[PDB]
Design a protein around this ligand. Structure first.
Ligand code: VDZ
Lengths: 11, 239
């Protein structure tokens, strides 16, 4: 995986 | 009729949608300009999709129960539904007058040829337009529209979902709200088989998602096209 941007936007 | 919890859920989703969908499309001016003379519309439409993913995420975080999910499942749900919710939410700008997405000005009016100028074929675009028409024809109340997007996002059968019983439980509460809303607030004849027709749209979206993923994979494989994408689109859709 790894989804730092999606993760960041998800809070 | 509609329970207080059900009325609550609708009010939150309405507000969530209003906070994430600007019906004046004012932010479109920040996008790389549309070019209609290659893949000339790829920079502009990549920016539009990228922006739209951000807004879909902002909507999703407000869905009652979505917050109780793990970040991993939040991620799997958003990654798999993002294009489907963009397809759903785009129905608000879509017009059957000329089969186009009309975002306020001729520069920001997108037709079949514009989408093909982003690297896509009729294999996607024809069923996409047909989706948009059949969706339009439902004449959804805004309440049904926002419930449909939320149900689409909290789908327990997405690959990689871990706590599916929980995702199903959150979805069921939304599904039951929608069914009750149709029964109590949507007058016949409009309400005729309306829930079943909304659920069929969710099925249509799976096929559209699969075809988009196929074409996107082909598009993004070329490093010169993937150059034109955004970091968020690359992270959400691949490569
Ligand atoms: C704010 C919005 C929606 O989020 C998005 C809008 C329109 C939707 C469109 C028109 C352009 C092309 C789109 C984004 C389609 C998309 C499959 C294009 C994919 C492009 C790429 C390169 C990421 O694969 C689906 C819905 C289509 C306009 C406005 O209603």
């Amino acid at each position: 995986k790894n989804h730092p941007m999606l993760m960041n936007l998800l809070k | 009729k509609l329970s207080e919890e059900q009325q609550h859920i609708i009010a939150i989703l309405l507000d969530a949608h209003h906070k994430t969908y600007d019906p004046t499309y004012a932010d479109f001016r920040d996008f790389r300009p549309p070019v209609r003379m290659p893949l000339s519309m790829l920079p502009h439409l990549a920016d539009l999709v990228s922006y739209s993913i951000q807004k879909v995420i902002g909507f999703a975080k407000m869905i009652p129960g979505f917050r109780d999910l793990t970040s991993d499942d939040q991620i799997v749900l958003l990654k798999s539904s993002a294009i489907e919710v963009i397809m759903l939410r785009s129905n608000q700008s879509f017009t059957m007058d000329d089969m186009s997405w009309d975002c306020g000005s001729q520069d920001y009016k997108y037709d079949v040829t514009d989408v093909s100028k982003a690297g896509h074929t009729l294999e996607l675009i024809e069923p996409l337009i047909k989706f948009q028409v059949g969706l339009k024809k439902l004449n959804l109340h805004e309440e049904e529209h926002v419930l449909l997007m939320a149900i689409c996002i909290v789908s327990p059968d997405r690959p990689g979902v871990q706590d599916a019983k929980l995702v199903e439980a959150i979805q069921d509460r939304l599904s039951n709200t929608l069914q009750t809303y149709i029964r109590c607030r949507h007058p016949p004849p409009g309400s005729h088989q309306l829930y079943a027709k909304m659920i069929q749209k969710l099925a249509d979206l799976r096929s559209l998602n699969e075809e988009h993923s196929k074409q996107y994979r082909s598009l993004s494989f070329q490093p010169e096209n993937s150059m034109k994408l955004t970091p968020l689109v690359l992270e959400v859709f691949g490569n």
